[PDB]
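User: Predict structure, ligand magnesium ion.
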Amino acid sequence: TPLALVGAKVSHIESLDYEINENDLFKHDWRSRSKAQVFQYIFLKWTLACLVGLFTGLIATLINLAVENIAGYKLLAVGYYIAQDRFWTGLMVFTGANLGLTLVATVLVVYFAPTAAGPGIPEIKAYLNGIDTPNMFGFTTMMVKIVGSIGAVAAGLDLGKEGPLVHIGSCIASLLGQGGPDNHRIKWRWLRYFNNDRDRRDLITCGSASGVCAAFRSPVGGVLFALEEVATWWRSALLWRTFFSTAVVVVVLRAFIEICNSGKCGLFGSGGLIMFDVSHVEVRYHAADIIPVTLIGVFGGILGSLYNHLLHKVLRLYNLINQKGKIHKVLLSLGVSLFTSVCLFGLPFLAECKPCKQFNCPNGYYNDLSTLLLTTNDDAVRNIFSSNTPNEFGMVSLWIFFGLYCILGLITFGIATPSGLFLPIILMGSAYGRMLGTAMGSYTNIDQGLYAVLGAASLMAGSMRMTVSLCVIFLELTNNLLLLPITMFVLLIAKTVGDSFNLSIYEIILHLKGLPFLEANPEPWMRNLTVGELNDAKPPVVTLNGVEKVANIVDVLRNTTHNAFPVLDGGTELHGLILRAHLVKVLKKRWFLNEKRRTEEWEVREKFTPVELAEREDNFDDVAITSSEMQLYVDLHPLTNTTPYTVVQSMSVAKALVLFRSVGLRHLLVVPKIQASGMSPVIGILTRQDLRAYNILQAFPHLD
Amino acid sequence: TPLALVGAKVSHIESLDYEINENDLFKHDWRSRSKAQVFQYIFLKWTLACLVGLFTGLIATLINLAVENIAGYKLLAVGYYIAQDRFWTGLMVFTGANLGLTLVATVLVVYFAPTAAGPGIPEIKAYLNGIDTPNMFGFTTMMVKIVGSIGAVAAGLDLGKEGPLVHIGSCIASLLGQGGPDNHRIKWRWLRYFNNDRDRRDLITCGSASGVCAAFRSPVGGVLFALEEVATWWRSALLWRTFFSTAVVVVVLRAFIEICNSGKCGLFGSGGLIMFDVSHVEVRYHAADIIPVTLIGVFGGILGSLYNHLLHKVLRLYNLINQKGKIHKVLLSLGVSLFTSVCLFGLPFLAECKPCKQFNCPNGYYNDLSTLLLTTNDDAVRNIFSSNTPNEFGMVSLWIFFGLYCILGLITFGIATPSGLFLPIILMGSAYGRMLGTAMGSYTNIDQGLYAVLGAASLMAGSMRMTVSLCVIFLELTNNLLLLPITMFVLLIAKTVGDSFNLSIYEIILHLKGLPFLEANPEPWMRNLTVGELNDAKPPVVTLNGVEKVANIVDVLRNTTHNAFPVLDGGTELHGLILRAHLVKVLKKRWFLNEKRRTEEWEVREKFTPVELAEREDNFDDVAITSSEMQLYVDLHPLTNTTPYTVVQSMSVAKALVLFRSVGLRHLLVVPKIQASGMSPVIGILTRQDLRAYNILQAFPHLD
Ligand SMILES: CCCCCCCC(=O)OC[C@H](COP(=O)(O)O[C@@H]1[C@H](O)[C@H](O)[C@@H](OP(=O)(O)O)[C@H](OP(=O)(O)O)[C@H]1O)OC(=O)CCCCCCC
Ligand SMILES: CCCCCCCC(=O)OC[C@H](COP(=O)(O)O[C@@H]1[C@H](O)[C@H](O)[C@@H](OP(=O)(O)O)[C@H](OP(=O)(O)O)[C@H]1O)OC(=O)CCCCCCC
Ligand SMILES: Nc1ncnc2c1ncn2[C@@H]1O[C@H](COP(=O)(O)OP(=O)(O)OP(=O)(O)O)[C@@H](O)[C@H]1O
Ligand SMILES: Nc1ncnc2c1ncn2[C@@H]1O[C@H](COP(=O)(O)OP(=O)(O)OP(=O)(O)O)[C@@H](O)[C@H]1O
Ligand SMILES: [Cl-]
Ligand SMILES: [Cl-]
Ligand SMILES: [Cl-]
Ligand SMILES: [Cl-]
Ligand SMILES: [Cl-]
Ligand SMILES: [Cl-]
Ligand SMILES: [Mg+2]
Ligand SMILES: [Mg+2]
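Assistant: Predicted complex:
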């Protein structure tokens, strides 16, 4: 089924073309170019990687600067009325401003760019696997994701800018490889080297890693994020261009931190999670700390699996509300923001007052819950992470904080709004961490702010099951490399306890959206099934001849939806594989022949250049062919990929899947091993759909 | 040619078996085991990864503790005679002790374990590529590498323990997967899961990464070292076991630093390069520092390429001296240690005395050259790296230090001794760094110890061309994550200038040794040559039948050196591929048949278990078959790999090499695309030798 979910939009799903056509007409290998053209490609490779890091760091500062200025002046308006002891007018100002900011973010998503809803990371993970996710990296998708995240984080919703920044950096990288938006591209001739799926995969890998770095000021952990979780294929040359892009981001981030520390960015200059200045120094290896630190890792895998189980149920319910229309998506976002505003305002009435933010109880008494609930989310993280504050938060007020963001983490992820998953899990993980550090009390020497850092890392390993990128991200946030063995100890337990119950949250969202992700290892029942038994449960192969009539090319373009056709002669010779995108091009160019001649090498080079062969902005329904041209002939030999990858009929599905994913294929031919004369030289085409364990188990149900 | 160099030993070279036989008789997939046996394999996977990190960290402390105790008391004996103003007796004590320590290290190498010479990193890089390097991970190779490194670093030679520790950790991992030495293995039944080349590749990857971590106390940079440089194949599950092993190493290293800081390890307790306690704090971005920092990167690529050019010439000369016999290897090591001792002692006589180590000039005057030359190498690094010492070393004495270790770096690498390449390059790189920082003088605010750190990183990127692992190694040495953009700036220039002249030093050593390393990308002339043209320049394929006579099996075992044979019938059916190691097993078991029957499924399971099918300690010359058994029959069907990877005759050599390296193959069948009856179903076998650009360019010379 070529139908899946992209963002919040049901769409048509194809695959990407990573395979190289080795004909010199196409010029797919950059090593076959001139010596001057290689230096142009190398210089533009490293200029694009610098501009990706420069623009991701510049946009992340502007999102950081606008959110705390909108939410900073919004709390002054609510603070203006609570000083006059008017709590009922301060509630409506707080709820009304949060409803208007959520309305701006959610109307831009549903009515202008529905793929800008969510974090966008499970669709970049699908795109770098080879799945052509449409409307993902446009210019209007990026602008809605930027403005819809400023309106959502400043509205006090339980979400972060951490997730959307990974998609913004991937959108910047895709727009720089084309020369701008899709109908406003500059036609600079040097940009023709990047009009292929092999180079767009390299660009979006640097762009998604710059967004992880812009979210956490972590230039090493951003490269380890894309290497471990997001990207499928990797080499050491891509590893060094990616690491260059993330170091430009921390140059831009640290240069604008020095400016916004000198008070010239306003009175709300000093930003959020990247402005984290608490290093936990001289952690003391006391032997009685084995019991609480192991319980941090055990509770992170238990709560991380329970959060994955309940979010999988909430997102199934939200898919029913989303299919009721576009006005039902807007009411779901405003209903969450209404419930969030009355719970972030009404719940500090139930807290206790500790003796000397003053809220609802007179002077000499400050509210420990209004410190966390009535602030921004990135400032509430730094209060729980704070060191040398041994009993700043009571045990009762931390249970209310933990129980609220357990509820707000479930209902905010999935609304038609640019959402995130890092900051809801950090807020939920730091709450039970400092609860377990306060409950130990005097029987431990680990700081209670360090228990909150270890708790936020454990809930993220229990939910997302990434571990080596999470270690370096939490080491570059705290700026303490001596915290590695105690951080890696709780990521070990939380991933182990978490993997024993269910899958990661990114495998669940990829399964809910129906995106055909190809996993690295085959199932053990795939080794007992062969490729030739898989071709008997599917219709026969639609092939073309080497010199083909125009009416046969038009017939396979109207009556089928396949994108590759084997090229035969009709003993008979298998020439290779021609794509659908090249069959439309010869019908649009009208490179037609009178007789059944096979042309020469100079005939195709007058009609086609390597630039127009790489373009994909063609459509078959605009091509009008009369019956005078339906009897002519097209020579398909200069446009056929004459070296496709093949398997034999007795090859297993397990080893064909390993070949399909290691090389990065879209189509895999099946040739006969029977070796007889008068045989068809191709008996199957395998695609991504045929080699998925979800689809094989429905046409062969007796294998599980 | 199956002849190459392994360490300092000419040896026979085969490849490793990574491909899975999907017959259930072999049990190669661990997912097809019982649920109890999977938990035994998972527990023993993570126990072995903990024991690799525990034993690599324990051995690295003992090498650190023994070297500075031997060299510490040796300098007290030389210091005893220079206080009596007897410099001629202090010279003979210094030269005599250094000659005796070099003699112990070099006799153990030439006469007991000749593969323990050098760093061992270019042979682990070859082993993880699929090349079966013999005598590399034995128990007596590890013990010679441990003792031969204590005797060599304490003898004042220009080499480090950094390189040999990568080979020691790989030897620990290989011995733990077998249960001890090769003739002293414990027969614990749970260790049968690790008797394959897929699991030895995972073990040695963690062991080589623990050795990089034990050398630099860098648990992140050790994982990035194996990922970028050493290992060929990588997945995210191996990435998390490797990162667990390196964090056990820094637990053991930091626990024995706290003990050897309290004076209980002796008066020479505080060790070397892992005892580096100079963080360079508040680096100030002054705009006049663009000119000296760019010159640090430009000189690192120029001197790094010139060092690669001259070491390639010195190692060619040393191969002529090594082939003159075993006593010529011992004299080359003693001649280098004689030249090193008289230059580390005689050269501080030429230096100037700066006013108040006192050497050769009276009180009120200390020698700035005796501080660097007459100490250990790891203590001379910390003096140049030292901060807030603005003019401790004169310009004249630093030219003598730089010019000496340019000479000593060339002649010490290659002697029959466990050598290294990190510490000669760090000493050479920190010398010109502090020369360029002293020459700027007052016109810069970057510390001159930070110029030495940036110079040592630039010469290592100009020579070894690794960049992302070198960044994190130098960030975890200095313990300063804010030094990333200025460190990555000079690694960018030095790798760029270095790559414009020649190759890295590990590609040169791999080429000098003749090891058949398979590179990731094919050459552009490989796309114009097909696989079927490659099979016409080689002898025809030696095949066997499915039920084969014993005399035919003995004939291909005596008259050929091939390790796989296609299994046919003789229209005719291609069954698959049988290995040479399984043909020796049925001749040793004498599973012989009277008639030409094909056996059943229960007949082979009485003769062979999955444990004895995985063992490789068999030899054909001990197998004695009389002429009464030469007319019998062997059923080769239950031992044949029935799903091998195949290509067609019209596939190019470029795309066959990509399939060969992505999957990890040893043999690749070539099937006909001609599709005729009465044809042989196999027309070629491709191996690692056939797909090498060095070998294709000699049988097809008109392609370059
Ligand atoms: C301060 C800014 C510093 C940035 C500049 C830093 C530029 C820099 O660091 O790269 C150096 C450049 C290599 O560029 P780059 O690493 O991107 O190119 C890779 C390199 O060519 C590998 O050798 C290839 O692998 P292989 O051999 O086929 O196996 C790999 O092919 P593939 O794996 O992708 O298929 C290539 O991608 O080499 C030069 O000397 C060009 C001098 C012109 C440089 C002009 C740069 C403007
Ligand atoms: C403090 C010490 C902490 C160390 C313990 C930390 C142990 C730990 O962290 O791993 C958890 C373990 C996974 O073990 P591990 O990651 O090594 O195994 C990989 C995992 O199974 C992947 O799912 C596989 O990929 P895929 O699915 O096929 O695609 C991969 O196969 P392959 O790619 O290799 O072919 C496997 O290698 O999962 C459990 O719940 C077992 C509970 C028993 C654990 C008992 C451990 C003693
Ligand atoms: N040329 C062809 N002739 C016959 N069947 C085909 C052909 N190409 C693909 N198929 C089969 O049709 C089914 C649907 O595939 P689809 O038409 O989506 O191919 P595709 O669009 O080329 O593949 P993808 O969607 O991965 O790009 C698949 O199971 C595939 O095996
Ligand atoms: N069964 C076979 N029949 C004929 N030729 C073969 C066979 N196997 C390998 N060859 C060819 O013989 C040449 C030498 O190969 P060699 O005998 O070293 O194979 P091998 O030992 O199996 O391979 P490797 O050394 O990579 O393990 C190679 O070019 C290869 O293509
Ligand atoms: Cl998403
Ligand atoms: Cl987020
Ligand atoms: Cl996410
Ligand atoms: Cl070596
Ligand atoms: Cl070394
Ligand atoms: Cl080395
Ligand atoms: Mg399709
Ligand atoms: Mg061989």
